[PDB]
Amino acid sequence: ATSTKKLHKEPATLIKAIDGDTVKLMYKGQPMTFRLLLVDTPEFNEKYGPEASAFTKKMRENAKKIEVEFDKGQRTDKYGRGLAYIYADGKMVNEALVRQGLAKVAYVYKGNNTHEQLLRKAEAQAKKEKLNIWS
Amino acid sequence: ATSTKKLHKEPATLIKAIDGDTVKLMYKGQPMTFRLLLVDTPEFNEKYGPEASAFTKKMRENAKKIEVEFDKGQRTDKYGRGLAYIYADGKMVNEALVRQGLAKVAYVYKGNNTHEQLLRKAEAQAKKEKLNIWS
Numbered sequence A, B: 001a002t003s004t005k006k007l008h009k010e011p012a013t014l015i016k017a018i019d020g021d022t023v024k025l026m027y028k029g030q031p032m033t034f035r036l037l038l039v040d041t042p043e044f045n046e047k048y049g050p051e052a053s054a055f056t057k058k059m060r061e062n063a064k065k066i067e068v069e070f071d072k073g074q075r076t077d078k079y080g081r082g083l084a085y086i087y088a089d090g091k092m093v094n095e096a097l098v099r100q101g102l103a104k105v106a107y108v109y110k111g112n113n114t115h116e117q118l119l120r121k122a123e124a125q126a127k128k129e130k131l132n133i134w135s
């Protein structure tokens, strides 16, 4: 019967965004996952985890230019991720996350802490304003 | 010397978008790749390939709601991809691509051709307007 031939729409959603302190990029011919130096965003299932992922996706998606800046030490972590400061039209993602209270300054290792004080300043300002993680 | 401690920014880019006739979605708890029924976008290295990928990404990224609609036949192709019509706020991605001359109507198989004439109408209109593939 013609009445039984109609189709039906079902729900779907986007695939879960990766944690906000990580970003996938093509660097010198290589897709790779970068882990953002000196910061930690919460896990997906923790308060601010999805907001931090959304924030980094927004920064990456809107950027006319993305740049990677390695520090003086190791270029990868023990999980094989690239370790860098990531910039979106000249604005450092690692600093913005901290400035908005969506990441804490964390994972400070020798040789890879050039921007430590810069990020601590951003964190202090997020705390003073009681933003997100600091609210 | 303090002068040699400065870091340097290097180029990076987004990872290549997937072909415009495919979309990755979470469906009933499962991330999977859907191949859009009844259409074919060009390959990445063919004219309109990147424009078609960009178009589908734009539709998926802006949607408040995404829906999947299977046809009456096979739910997967021989590559293990889901076969469906994909809608973004009620607008069918498969039809839009064809309507803009970014995909041709193609891969018409028995049991999975419910929207064949709808898509042929969209294609005829893209051709009449000499859009993209038809220019």
Ligand SMILES: Cc1cn([C@H]2C[C@H](OP(=O)(O)O)[C@@H](COP(=O)(O)O)O2)c(=O)[nH]c1=O
Residues within 6 Å of the ligand: A019, A021, A035, A036, A037, A038, A039, A040, A041, A077, A078, A083, A107, A109
């Ligand atoms: C940022 C950073 C993380 N890591 C490691 C420390 C943690 O692994 P261990 O717990 O095994 O020590 C992990 C946290 O990353 P995530 O916050 O992405 O989970 O990544 C580094 O080794 N170097 C770094 O610079």
Ligand SMILES: Cc1cn([C@H]2C[C@H](OP(=O)(O)O)[C@@H](COP(=O)(O)O)O2)c(=O)[nH]c1=O
Residues within 6 Å of the ligand: B019, B021, B035, B036, B037, B038, B039, B040, B041, B077, B078, B083, B107, B109
């Ligand atoms: C759309 C569609 C494609 N396919 C197969 C046909 C082509 O594989 P064969 O060339 O091995 O026959 C391939 C084209 O997909 P792509 O355009 O994604 O490359 O996908 C189906 O089997 N069923 C379908 O409905």
Ligand SMILES: [Ca+2]
Residues within 6 Å of the ligand: A019, A021, A040, A041, A042, A043
């Ligand atoms: Ca983390």
Ligand SMILES: [Ca+2]
Residues within 6 Å of the ligand: B019, B021, B040, B041, B042, B043
């Ligand atoms: Ca194709």
